[PDB]
């Protein structure tokens, strides 16, 4: 996030980090319950990658984080990599997350929910802060 | 990438207004936000775009794509969850 600010630790409990076996953060995701994570199809997640929950500072060794293994990768069959349309992939955890004060689920909207132009929302992540 | 989790507030735009920047690349299962001085960037992909509705934070978009330079004056593009939630429900029910 360019021009963002540091979050209050644990205040976005559904935010997870997708990291490869090397420990390298490459994408974000959101917990929708203790066994499923929603992420982007273009992230190209495989079952060798790990879902890290409860993390705030990726450079810290003293956070009680949860490194969860991925059982399956469900790439939306309608995803079009040429247009990046329907960019969603669901991840089924082989090991369920343990919900706590710092790990919980975000709500999903109803297909008929209206979110008007001009509404201020929030986006979170560990992406580049300067490009 | 930063060690600590970042956050940013940003406005949602209409797909019509967003097409003024991206033209026909803006499809129905996409929702735009930003062009407000902040920008999602590389490494943010797959993360959430949440809006508070009736007191709870709800997932409106998934960080998807945007300016190759993460320009804070161009709208960022997110997968519109409202157009994909029925698939999420089917997938969860069957597996």
């Amino acid at each position: 996030i360019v021009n963002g600010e540091e979050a209050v630790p644990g205040s976005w409990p559904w935010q997870v980090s997708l990291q490869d076996k090397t420990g390298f953060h490459f994408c974000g995701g959101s917990l929708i319950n203790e066994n499923w994570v929603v992420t982007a199809a273009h992230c190209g997640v495989t079952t060798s990658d790990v879902v890290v929950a409860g993390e705030f500072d990726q450079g810290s060794s003293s956070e009680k984080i949860q490194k969860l293994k991925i059982a399956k990768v469900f790439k939306n069959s309608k995803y079009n990599s040429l247009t990046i349309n329907n960019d969603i992939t669901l991840l089924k955890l082989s090991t369920a997350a343990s919900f706590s004060q710092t790990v919980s689920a975000v709500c999903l909207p109803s297909a008929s929910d209206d979110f008007a132009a001009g509404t201020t929302c929030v986006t979170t992540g560990w992406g580049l802060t300067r490009y | 990438t930063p060690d600590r989790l970042q956050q940013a507030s940003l406005p949602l735009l209409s797909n019509t207004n967003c097409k003024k920047y991206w033209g026909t690349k803006i499809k129905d299962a996409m929702i735009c936000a930003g062009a407000s001085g902040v920008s999602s960037c590389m490494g943010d992909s797959g993360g959430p775009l949440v809006c508070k509705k009736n007191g709870a934070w709800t997932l409106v978009g998934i960080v998807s794509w945007g300016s190759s330079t993460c320009s804070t004056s161009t709208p960022g593009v997110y997968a519109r969850v409202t157009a994909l939630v029925n698939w999420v429900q089917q997938t969860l029910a069957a597996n």
Binding site: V8, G10, S11, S104, V106 | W57
Partner: peptide, 10 residues
């Protein structure tokens, strides 16, 4: 869902 135990500060 959607209600964090630790409130975000924006």
């Amino acid at each position: 869902c959607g209600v964090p135990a630790i409130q975000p500060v924006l």
